[PDB]
Write an enzyme that holds these catalytic residues in place. Structure first.
Site, PDB file in Angstrom:
ATOM      1  N   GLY C  67       0.755  -1.075   0.021  1.00 53.00           N
ATOM      2  CA  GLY C  67      -0.071  -0.318   0.086  1.00 53.00           C
ATOM      3  C   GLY C  67       0.801   1.455   0.047  1.00 53.00           C
ATOM      4  CB  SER C  96       7.409  -2.989  -1.375  1.00 55.70           C
ATOM      5  OG  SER C  96       6.132  -2.550  -1.599  1.00 55.70           O
ATOM      6  CG  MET C  97       3.631  -0.420   3.669  1.00 53.92           C
ATOM      7  SD  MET C  97       4.924  -0.067   4.671  1.00 53.92           S
ATOM      8  CE  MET C  97       5.672   1.024   3.714  1.00 53.92           C
ATOM      9  CG  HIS C 121       7.840  -3.459  -5.669  1.00 51.90           C
ATOM     10  ND1 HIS C 121       7.297  -4.021  -4.845  1.00 51.90           N
ATOM     11  CD2 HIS C 121       7.414  -2.310  -6.156  1.00 51.90           C
ATOM     12  CE1 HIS C 121       5.999  -3.332  -4.597  1.00 51.90           C
ATOM     13  NE2 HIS C 121       6.197  -2.534  -5.405  1.00 51.90           N
ATOM     14  CG  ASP C 170       8.634  -7.537  -7.660  1.00 52.15           C
ATOM     15  OD1 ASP C 170       8.772  -8.467  -7.002  1.00 52.15           O
ATOM     16  OD2 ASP C 170       7.427  -7.034  -7.637  1.00 52.15           O
TER      17      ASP C 170
END
Ligand code: ADP
Lengths: 190, 190, 191
Positions: C67, C96-97, C121, C170
């Site tokens: 997000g 990622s988050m 990423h 990624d």
């Protein structure tokens, strides 16, 4: 609208929903496409039942047409991790991920209704963009396919070759045939 | 001794009368106790005995005459109640300090709370202590006293009732048995 | 729908929803795309648990697909500010988050299930406007990437250069690879 059912207690009568009342009996329902939010709800119910009685076996019905594979793993890992033996009861359509949950059920307690339909297929997904990015996503889905196929052979007991062949293309399996493949122990007697 | 022993125990009457009554009673007792040509001097032992009966004490608390009972109090209870010996040592030690004159001046002998699983012998050790010490056992079920109106019964009577000889149920019960164990069950519910 | 559950208390029975019942046990749930609203609920739960027992450790389950980065900082900063150590368990997958919050847990309390996935990423964003405005936004997103790579290196323990190479594109890290990479201490199988 979900109906409410009164419960009988010595202190006083209480009101609970039909789904919540069934939870008191260690019955967890599963339906609809697998989603992140839906999976965490089932996971929460499993953890709560474990604390109440880690010995009493849990019952998990499945009527989903399949969904995201990632969220389904959260349910699988929890079922293996929790000490209670989940009794997977296939009451309807069971897609690739839906069928995977049935195999995860503890051996000797897996069940499937006689007219239930259980279809298995390889994971379906795609990506679009630069070739370098596609390579990462392409390798990842192939790796995921191996993991699901490997875990399928663990519970079912069939060789990787057999699992690869049936899952390479869409396959539809009936309830009696599932016993031969080892997906389910046996149909419910009554 | 008589003046001090009367002030601490006989609180219903005032100081001059209570001291004179035990002095007059002690002398009369010394007259009837011997058959002929016995000791004239009145020992404190005799004084302690007369004040005990007036206060309804069993004559054992006044002076530590029955030191043997305290020596084997723990062992006697420990054999009757198998397990939770740690609990028994604390109750006995409290009884010893008070009988040795090291107890609280204006507080009960021992205030204790038994926090344990239901079914364990929490009440059992209490009952064996009463039977072993030769003292009444007052058992109150606090579950009954869960409403505001019920609390009034402890201190007071229903409105419109004189209750001169009955009064409270807790307050008067200790008057009949000053040296007695007071047991309250399910205090949390109270 | 959220199923209700009943708990036993001395005075009377207590009815709580399934999610709130787990809150009493210091079990937070981070599901779905990160957002300023859902993140506000997560930090609210963290602050509430701290007052109850600032010693007992919190458990934050992670099944988010990624997000906005702004909302993640509120959760990350809150986790480090509070005294209780937050235990991050990757359920299903961590983007990622989510991975950033996952590795942000206290050392020794970071876990991943054997079948969970972990993707990482560089931050993704876009600004359409005049050249002068794009210049400011381009610098900010690059600065944001710098702040994430530096913090990821601190928790993971890898060098900034290694994270930059791995985070340029990624990359999907399986559960065992996360332990080798340094994102989590070990798999959650025994306790
Ligand atoms: N340690 C023990 N030794 C002997 N009998 C015991 C012991 N603990 C419990 N019991 C028995 O269990 C029953 C209930 O004991 P009780 O003290 O009334 O329980 P509770 O404290 O839960 O009300 C009685 O028959 C009592 O004699």
């Amino acid at each position: 609208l979900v109906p409410m059912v009164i419960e009988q207690t010595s202190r006083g009568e209480r009101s609970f929903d039909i789904y919540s009342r069934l939870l008191k009996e260690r019955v967890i329902f599963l339906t609809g496409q697998v989603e992140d939010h839906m999976a965490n709800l089932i996971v929460a119910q499993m953890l709560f039942l474990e604390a109440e009685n880690p010995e009493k076996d849990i019952y998990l019905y499945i009527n989903s047409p399949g969904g995201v594979i990632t969220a389904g793993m959260s349910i699988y890992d929890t079922m293996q991790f929790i000490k209670p033996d989940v009794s997977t009861i296939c009451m309807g359509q069971a897609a690739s991920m839906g069928a995977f949950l049935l195999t995860a059920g503890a051996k000797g307690k897996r069940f499937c209704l006689p007219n239930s339909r259980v279809m298995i297929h390889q994971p379906l997904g795609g990506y679009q963009g630069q070739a370098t990015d596609i390579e990462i996503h392409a390798r990842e889905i192939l790796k995921v396919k191996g993991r699901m196929n490997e875990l399928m052979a663990l519970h079912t007991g069939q060789s990787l070759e057999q699992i690869e062949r049936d899952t390479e293309r869409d396959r539809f399996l009936s309830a009696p045939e599932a016993v031969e493949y080892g997906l389910v122990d046996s149909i419910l007697t009554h | 001794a008589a003046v001090e022993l009367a002030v601490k125990y006989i609180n219903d009457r005032h100081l001059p009368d209570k001291a004179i009554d035990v002095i007059d009673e002690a002398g009369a007792r010394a007259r009837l106790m011997p058959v002929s040509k016995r000791k004239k001097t009145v020992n404190v032992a005799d004084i302690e005995s007369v004040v005990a009966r007036i206060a309804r004490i069993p004559e054992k608390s006044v002076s530590q005459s029955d030191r043997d009972t305290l020596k084997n109090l723990g062992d006697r209870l420990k054999m009757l109640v198998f397990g939770q010996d740690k609990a028994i040592e604390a109750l006995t030690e409290a009884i010893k300090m008070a009988r040795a004159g090291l107890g609280h001046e204006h507080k009960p002998v021992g205030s204790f709370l038994f926090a344990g699983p239901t079914g364990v012998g929490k009440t059992e050790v209490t009952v064996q202590l009463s039977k072993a010490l030769g003292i009444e056992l007052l058992r109150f079920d606090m579950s009954e006293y869960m409403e505001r109106h019920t609390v009034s019964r402890l201190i007071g009577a229903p409105p419109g009732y004189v209750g001169f000889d009955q009064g409270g149920l807790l307050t008067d019960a200790v008057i009949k048995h000053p040296h007695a164990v007071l047991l309250l069950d399910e205090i949390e519910k109270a």
